[PDB]
């Protein structure tokens, strides 16, 4: 069992809690308290390795949080989530990413850019701008849907893969 500390970040309403609960409990939450921050520890198999994912589902954008401070410093991977029907959530990505890098004091922080809510027809963030942004960062870009579970596993498994590549480089 190999441990992996992940932190799910992104604007309110992007689907962080829904993505996290889809991964851990295999159910879509239509409503979930936007205010609650919580951690989850689940055993999973990724590329033959039995992993233990310790995920922090962040909340409370405007307020202080000691748990999020501890997870931002010690976290190995960060799932940077935006919603494809929300250009402001996409525009906040660089802010979360640069905040993460500064708290980590490193330009080598494993991250995956997630474009959640790909099941919706009303779309505002073109796959091109998000792909170009991920390419500029040198990070993978996965489109997901917590509602249909599309790409949910691929998003967190890819983050674990980025952490392995970083861990073997150092």
């Amino acid at each position: 069992s190999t441990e992996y500390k992940l932190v799910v970040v992104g604007a309110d309403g992007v689907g962080k809690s829904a993505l996290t609960i889809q991964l851990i409990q295999n159910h879509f939450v239509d409503e979930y308290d936007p205010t609650i921050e919580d951690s989850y520890r689940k055993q999973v198999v990724i590329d033959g390795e039995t992993c233990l994912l310790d995920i922090l589902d962040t909340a409370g954008q405007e307020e202080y949080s000691a748990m999020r401070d501890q997870y931002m410093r010690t976290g190995e991977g960060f799932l940077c989530v935006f919603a494809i029907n929300n250009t402001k959530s996409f525009e906040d990505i660089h802010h979360y990413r640069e905040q993460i890098k500064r708290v980590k004091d490193s330009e080598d922080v494993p991250m995956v850019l997630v474009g959640n809510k790909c099941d919706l027809p009303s779309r505002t963030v073109d796959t091109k701008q998000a792909q170009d942004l991920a390419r500029s960062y040198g990070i993978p870009f996965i489109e997901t849907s917590a509602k249909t579970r599309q790409g949910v596993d691929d998003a967190f498994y890819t983050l674990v893969r980025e952490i392995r590549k970083h861990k073997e480089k150092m």
Binding site: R68, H95, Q99, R102
Partner: peptide
């Protein structure tokens, strides 16, 4: 007070 915001209060 590490930004940008991002999370408020990350110091």
């Amino acid at each position: 007070a590490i930004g940008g915001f991002g999370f408020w209060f990350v110091d």
